[PDB]
Amino acid sequence: MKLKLIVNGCEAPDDYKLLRTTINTVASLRKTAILRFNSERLTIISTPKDTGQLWCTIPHDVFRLYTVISARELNTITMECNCDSLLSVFKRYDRVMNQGSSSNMTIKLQSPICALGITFEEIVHNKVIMHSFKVPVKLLFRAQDTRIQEPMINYIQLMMYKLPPISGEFGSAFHGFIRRVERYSNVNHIHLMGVKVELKIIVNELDWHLEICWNGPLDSVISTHEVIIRCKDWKVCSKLYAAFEEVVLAISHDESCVFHCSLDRGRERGQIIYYIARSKGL
């Protein structure tokens, strides 16, 4: 039960941004989060158990040092922590470099309920100001960890859409297309449309209809695909799309929707998957 890690944001930008995006997403989704510290990767899980699940994979090479030892299988240390305290710590550490610094963030598991000793340094202008934090966490049991599993997705009718990268010419237009439905206050369900490439956002109600359509170029990696989902999950999808260049959208006919985000670190690639159940039936 000896967990210790060191994070340096300035040394490696992309994976630190991935970690910050994962923390922001799990904080925005719901309170508390599951941190599974496997010996070769760290998985951050937000399980509400209709509401979606976020399964982000963070390789061990992301952090400068990843000593993980426990009596469980493959040194699996599973912990539940409040995202708000971790989010506040990460905001402080982000402002530490924003004011100008390159100090590392040391995290140790100092003692079932434990706490992480997230301590880092900051220099104003040549002064030493030690920032010490202790976030109370609970230690999930081994069987309780086994009760949490990533939901597999069937491929019988599931169809992939390769959304354009946001760094490209069409990326800003596609981001505007995604957020075009967010400017309506009285929207709770978005009914997607894909026929076999077009992505259509349809919001049909008693006395008003909406027909947002994407006329730009799109790719499907390698038939109608309709699923109606809540608007709050679509906000999370839009937030994830902006922070990831490689974004893959999977739509299942009246079953589910999958928002796949991948960060090409090559090296093991960091991936974020947001499984979303249909709010209601077609």
Binding site: G176, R180, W208, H209, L210, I212, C213, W214, G216
Partner: protein
Amino acid sequence: NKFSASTVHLEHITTALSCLTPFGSKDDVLIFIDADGLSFVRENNHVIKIQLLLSRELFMSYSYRNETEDHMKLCVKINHILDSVSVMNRNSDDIVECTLSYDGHGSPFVLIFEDSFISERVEYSTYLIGLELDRERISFEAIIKGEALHSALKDLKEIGCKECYVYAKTEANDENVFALISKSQLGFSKIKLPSNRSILEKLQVFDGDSTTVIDGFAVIGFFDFTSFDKIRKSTKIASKVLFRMDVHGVLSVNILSQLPKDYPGIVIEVCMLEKESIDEAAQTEIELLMET
């Protein structure tokens, strides 16, 4: 279609429709369509009414094929209309092109937005389908700049202001005073506008006939601040606000917010009723505090 119009200046439409946000958040909005343009008339509890005037010159594809009637009236919701005109038309290279459409009775009010990359069609079903001051009995007339009136209204809002008062008194020495006395948790609150011509450009007090300019007498207006705050967002974009009130207790606000070179701004007309003021001794305290 019986009516069609296309525009590229969606920010102006967005602000004009957001001027109606102080009114009912999710209620009905009634639209006239004629050759001069289209108008949005909104009323609340039969005590206050707002009205927009979007001229034809503002649009660049105004057609109005209708010939059976001089005007076409349709009643729809306002919130989804605001969200539709809330595109903000970013990415200046590719301007969003709106297209309002209506095909007579039984047809939805279509709002087509084209970005050459994103196509959005919004349809609104129509529903089944007054406060005017007489232009002969005006008690007072004032022309106030929009910024000062907006600041006064915001300060009144920030101090509660359950009730509000309007003071308008002219003097023989060409001195004019205009103040907003308010009832709130604080007690007696006043906000007197400057007598300079930069803000109080004109202030004329009449004898209830709109002709004789009488001096030394004050016009009192007792208005519920829930109705008064409806004009706060209208005065935010106003360049000059025109104030008029007759003896019948009706307050009319003429918002003059002076993009196409031919259209004469957006005309916003707000008409508001005056409280009964059963207590006759309240006005006595108003004038006593005004004299000091």
